[PDB]
Amino acid sequence: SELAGTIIDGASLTFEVLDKVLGELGKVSRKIAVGIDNESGGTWTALNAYFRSGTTDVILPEVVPNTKALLYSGRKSSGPVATGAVAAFAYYMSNGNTLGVMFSVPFDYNWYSNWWDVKIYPGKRRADQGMYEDMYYGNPYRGDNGWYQKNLGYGLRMKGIMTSAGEAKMQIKISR
Numbered sequence: 720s721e722l723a724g725t726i727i728d729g730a731s732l733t734f735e736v737l738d739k740v741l742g743e744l745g746k747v748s749r750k751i752a753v754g755i756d757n758e759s760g761g762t763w764t765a766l767n768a769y770f771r772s773g774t775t776d777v778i779l780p781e782v783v784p785n786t787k788a789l790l791y792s793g794r795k796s797s798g799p800v801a802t803g804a805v806a807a808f809a810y811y812m813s814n815g816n817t818l819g820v821m822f823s824v825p826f827d828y829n830w831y832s833n834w835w836d837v838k839i840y841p842g843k844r845r846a847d848q849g850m851y852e853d854m855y856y857g858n859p860y861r862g863d864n865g866w867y868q869k870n871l872g873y874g875l876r877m878k879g880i881m882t883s884a885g886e887a888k889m890q891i892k893i894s895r
Contacts, residue, residue, distance in 0.1 A: 720744045721776060722752045722792030729756040729892060732788035734880060737888030746794040749886070751804035755820065756788035756892030759875060761813030769846040772796050772805035772824075779808060788892070802826050807846040816873060817844045821851055822889055835860050836869070837877050837891065862887065 724740040725732060732754055740752045751773050757763050765779035773793025783789055791808075795801035803824035810818040817840040825831050836858030844850070858869055862881025868891075871877055879891035 722750055723790040726789045729788040734890045737890055747798055749795050749803055751793040753791045753889040754788055757783050758786050759893040763810040766809055766811045767845050768808035770806040772802040807851045809846040819846055833861050839871055
């Protein structure tokens with residue numbers, strides 16, 4: 720039972736599916752369910768991922784169809800006691816770029832903030848701690864409730880939603 724519900728059309732795969740799946744598939748005490756919607760224009764082929772706290776089995780599917788959404792799972796490092804949910808992954812676009820998604824959920828939110836960003840490298844690029852922390856400081860977003868995001872280069876726009884509720888979900892959809 721991994722925190723991967725369904726990957727059906729984004730019209731059905733929404734924030735609500737992420738809130739519910741945490742209770743349905745709920746691996747350990749602190750669980751992470753995110754919902755990215757691929758509408759950038761092309762099938763997303765998995766290349767590589769980098770998990771530091773959200774340590775899981777599988778998150779990068781072989782190929783993802785466009786105009787649709789997907790789910791990610793992750794559970795803590797030690798299991799019962801550890802950091803909330805921290806990981807970064809990347810997706811190969813058929814247009815000739817690499818969508819590098821970044822997500823960080825600490826545990827001492829009382830002091831340390833939880834910045835989150837998304838960029839698209841101009842070619843086949845990995846996701847590692849250097850590239851994570853190098854772009855982390857670039858978009859100081861803690862997940863403002865409602866719908867909050869940044870504009871992307873190359874003529875693109877990604878849309879996202881998170882909240883400071885502590886154990887909240889993460890949903891990001893590309894909207895041209």
